[PDB]
Amino acid sequence: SPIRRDAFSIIEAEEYNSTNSSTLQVIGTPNNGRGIGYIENGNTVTYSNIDFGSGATGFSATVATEVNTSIQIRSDSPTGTLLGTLYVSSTGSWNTYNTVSTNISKITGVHDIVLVFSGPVNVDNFIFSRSS
Ligand SMILES: [Ca+2]
Ligand code: NA
Secondary structure, three states, X not given: OOOOEEOOOOEEOOOOOEEOOOOOEEEXXXXXXXXXXXXXXXXXXXXXXXXXXXXXXXXXEEEXXXXXXXXXXXXXXXXXXXXXXXXXXXXXXXXXXXXXXXXXXXXXXXXXXXXXXXXXXXXXXXXXXXXX
């Protein structure tokens, strides 16, 4: 998977750098894209060297799920700074994707990003939004 990436261009969830998961699979999406699924509570997924430049204050992910769930967004490691939490309610099916966004604390420079899952969700991609 890429060693580094820009925070302000689409990051593919299936191009992760490490995970603790023993269940996670790369899955297909309805329009022949890919994502990650078979995710369980406590799973972490790490994306290396995301460059936030002069600042990001939002996060958007394209997700599908049939359960209410949340995803923590952490910097540097699973126990690094909690930037925010994305709360996702059911999108209607495991193949109905929705773009969902949340606020995060302003982060700058280059950091790894860890997504921490409280339950099953399928994730196609995500992107950050620049600070004002
Ligand atoms: Ca994808
Ligand atoms: Na394992």
